[PDB]
A paper describes a structure:
Here, we present InCellCryst, an advanced pipeline for producing homogeneous microcrystals directly within living insect cells. We have demonstrated the pipeline on five different proteins (IMPDH, HEX-1, Cathepsin B, Luciferase and EGFP-µNS), representing a selection of soluble proteins of different source organisms that crystallize in insect cells in their native compartment or, in case of peroxisomes, readily in the cytoplasm or nucleus of the cells. Importantly, as shown for IMPDH and HEX-1, InCellCryst can produce crystals from native protein sequences, without purification tags or even remnants of proteolytically removed tags, within a quasi-native cellular environment. The rich source of biomolecules in the cellular environment allows the identification of native ligands by co-crystallization at quasi physiological conditions, representing a unique feature of InCellCryst.
Author numbering: 29 to 175
Write the structure that this text describes.
């Protein structure tokens, strides 16, 4: 499974990526359970496009501290070396080459990536989710030059 970070429920908005039923999903609905009062998250699996739901995890770590959280994936940042037929050639921080990294079909990512790549290839990074062996670029960033 993907490496994860804990995210307080008050910091979750529609469109955020969460782990729902063990799967990285884009949140499309946030509601309150009538039975438990907890937040319930409905999401679309980034890889399979199936719907998944999961309710928040409530914990009590210290006196008078009551916390609702969810898990989000740890995103990796890769350099883009080339774009070819709906996939990209990417490079990890350590130089490891990924020859056929898929790009999610979401929010015009491929077109935005192609536009930025053609005007400055190596300031272009992709944010990558890695789940059960599979990797996919799910967003992009233009790296500020000073970095």
């Amino acid at each position: 499974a993907s490496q994860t970070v804990t995210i307080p429920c008050h910091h979750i908005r529609l469109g955020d990526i969460l782990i729902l039923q063990g799967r990285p999903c884009q949140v499309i609905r946030i509601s309150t359970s009538a039975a438990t009062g907890q937040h319930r998250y409905l999401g679309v699996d980034l890889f399979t496009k199936q719907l998944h739901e999961e309710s928040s995890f409530v914990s009590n770590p210290a006196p008078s501290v009551v916390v609702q959280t969810m898990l989000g994936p740890v995103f990796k940042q890769y350099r883009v070396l080339d774009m070819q037929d709906g996939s990209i050639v990417a490079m990890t921080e350590t130089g490891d080459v990924k020859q056929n990294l898929p790009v999610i079909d979401q929010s015009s990512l491929w077109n935005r990536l192609q536009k930025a790549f053609e005007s400055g290839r190596g300031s272009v990074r992709v944010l990558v989710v890695s789940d059960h062996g599979r990797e996919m670029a799910v967003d992009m960033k233009v790296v500020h030059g000073s970095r």
